[PDB]
Amino acid sequence: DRVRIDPVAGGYYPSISPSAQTRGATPDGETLKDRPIFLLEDGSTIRLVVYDDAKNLLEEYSKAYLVRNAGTSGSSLLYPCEVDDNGAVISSSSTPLYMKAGTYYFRILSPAKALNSKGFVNIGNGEYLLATDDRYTQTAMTAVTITNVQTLYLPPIINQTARMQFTVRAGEGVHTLEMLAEGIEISGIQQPLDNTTSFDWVNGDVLPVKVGDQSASVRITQATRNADNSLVAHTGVLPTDARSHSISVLLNLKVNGNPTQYQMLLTGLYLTAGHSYNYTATVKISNGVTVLTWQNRSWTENVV
Amino acid sequence: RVRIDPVAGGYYPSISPSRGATPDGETLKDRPIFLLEDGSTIRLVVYDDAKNLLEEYSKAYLVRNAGTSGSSLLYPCEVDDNGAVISSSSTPLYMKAGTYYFRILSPAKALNSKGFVNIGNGEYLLATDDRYTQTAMTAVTITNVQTLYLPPIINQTARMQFTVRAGEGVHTLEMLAEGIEISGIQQPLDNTTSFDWVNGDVLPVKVGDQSASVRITQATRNADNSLVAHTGVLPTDARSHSISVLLNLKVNGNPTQYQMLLTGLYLTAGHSYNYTATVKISNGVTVLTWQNRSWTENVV
Numbered sequence A: 001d002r003v004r005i006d007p008v009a010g011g012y013y014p015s016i017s018p019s020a021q022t023r024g025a026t027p028d029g030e031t032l033k034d035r036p037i038f039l040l041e042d043g044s045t046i047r048l049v050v051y052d053d054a055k056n057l058l059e060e061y062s063k064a065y066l067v068r069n070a071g072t073s074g075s076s077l078l079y080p081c082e083v084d085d086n087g088a089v090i091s092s093s094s095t096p097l098y099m100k101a102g103t104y105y106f107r108i109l110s111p112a113k114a115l116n117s118k119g120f121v122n123i124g125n126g127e128y129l130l131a132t133d134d135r136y137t138q139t140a141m142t143a144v145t146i147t148n149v150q151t152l153y154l155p156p157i158i159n160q161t162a163r164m165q166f167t168v169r170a171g172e173g174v175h176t177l178e179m180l181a182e183g184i185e186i187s188g189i190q191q192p193l194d195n196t197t198s199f200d201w202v203n204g205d206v207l208p209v210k211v212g213d214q215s216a217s218v219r220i221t222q223a224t225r226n227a228d229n230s231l232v233a234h235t236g237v238l239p240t241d242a243r244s245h246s247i248s249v250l251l252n253l254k255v256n257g258n259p260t261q262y263q264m265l266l267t268g269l270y271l272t273a274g275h276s277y278n279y280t281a282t283v284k285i286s287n288g289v290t291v292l293t294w295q296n297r298s299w300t301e302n303v304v
Numbered sequence B: 001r002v003r004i005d006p007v008a009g010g011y012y013p014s015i016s017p018s019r020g021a022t023p024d025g026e027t028l029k030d031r032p033i034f035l036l037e038d039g040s041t042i043r044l045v046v047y048d049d050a051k052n053l054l055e056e057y058s059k060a061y062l063v064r065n066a067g068t069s070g071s072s073l074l075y076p077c078e079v080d081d082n083g084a085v086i087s088s089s090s091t092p093l094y095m096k097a098g099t100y101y102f103r104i105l106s107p108a109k110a111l112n113s114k115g116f117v118n119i120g121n122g123e124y125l126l127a128t129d130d131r132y133t134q135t136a137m138t139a140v141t142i143t144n145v146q147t148l149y150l151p152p153i154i155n156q157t158a159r160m161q162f163t164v165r166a167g168e169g170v171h172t173l174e175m176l177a178e179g180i181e182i183s184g185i186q187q188p189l190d191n192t193t194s195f196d197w198v199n200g201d202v203l204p205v206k207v208g209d210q211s212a213s214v215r216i217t218q219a220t221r222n223a224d225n226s227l228v229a230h231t232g233v234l235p236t237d238a239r240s241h242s243i244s245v246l247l248n249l250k251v252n253g254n255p256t257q258y259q260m261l262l263t264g265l266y267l268t269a270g271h272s273y274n275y276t277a278t279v280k281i282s283n284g285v286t287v288l289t290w291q292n293r294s295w296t297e298n299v300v
């Protein structure tokens, strides 16, 4: 007696480097106007969060989907799936979402993570989360009116966390460059928000940019290799204000078969959602001594 | 007493950063020597064969690149304690026969109680350096007149330079009276009694102090409308600590302030730490962007 819901992927806005923010109208229609939309990555999962016309959660219409870029000209297709609380697929079963007629609000999360007691998701450091963002018009939450089957056109989603990337190049005298099991440890970042603090995500609440601490850390254990023998390591970090504090970055690398450790102490940092904080480091041999040199672009606003 | 006619040996200018086996004969081997700048002063510091100060043979000279070759000529002069000429009334140097050690300073600053000169931030000092063979202290044996060939001199402080470019939407870019203020650099006021310059002591690379600061009020303009500001800074260990650069600029007629926080820096004598900062308009908002270049060593 209901209606089958066929959701159509809207893609995502990938993470970009910082540049001075649009201090304008909430919601912002100008920040993403010239931003390209990428296809949702093949094998990723999305959670469809349904609300009634009064913006109240409808747990019964909560559905998870598996992405397969199997459409016309490599387009994305969404397959009903069953996931764990972290959004990883656990079973085969493809049960379609059937809904009654009416007007509903809907939000998206990727990975298809489980909703907590406060109506949002549990998110720490060392993870990415694409979702509905009320900060921009392009990604803002939409309503659908349901009248056999109906096509649900999904708006594009955007990153809720910051991203840090380290490219480590093999410089003068470096023949072999690998990651140690200890990898890259980022320290002095935001400690993840408590489950006792209220967050009304459906009405526009977003992760705060509060002061990080000496005890919160994240470890990157995996890196990819470029043709030039350089390593690329990346991770998600929660939005954190460390403008008055330091963020230490410890790189544990195996240079020419010997274990080494290098520390980058980074002061004056404002890590925000949807941005990449890219670093390019080079391991060199000066005499017999191994050094790490790095470079990175920095942006600061007028204080006056 | 023999008349001393000193002949300028030039100087090794400040370069961008790029080991230890003292004295080092390899660091400066392919480095070019510049002529001492016209109007600058040099102070001659004389010691006996046992390396004891001879205050009576202390002399200051004024540089004039008037030499029959295009060379620097040294004219006896009278200076203030900061090395500025107060009179160019030339009284030549006359010395008795024997063996003497000699050191050079530029500007011709006055020697303090410890036998060195008072140096702070916001100044350059060229001098004799025992760290390199080319600039190391020499002895002279005096036997009517004698020509004293001076070895080249080199910088005792670090140098910082900021090039501020006029980026997208920037029509006018000037310095405010507040200019560029650098803090978190070595404290000149943190005194050492343990300074024996004649036997090879050099300025320590101390951890900086936020209380220690310097202000650049003057800048030059490049053809592309960019500004160039620079200053001397005493050797600073900003590897684990930061240097703060506050740039007070007038962008398109409005006063602005930007903070650069720099880290992973070991600022040493004779080196230039150069920054290229661009003032941009993103929407209506003005930003400053630059590139960090840091280095760190293996701890293992």
Ligand SMILES: [Cl-]
Binding pocket: A031, A273, A274, A275
């Ligand atoms: Cl963004």
Ligand SMILES: [Cl-]
Binding pocket: B014, B124, B155, B159
């Ligand atoms: Cl200089």
Ligand SMILES: [Cl-]
Binding pocket: B027, B269, B270, B271
């Ligand atoms: Cl040098």
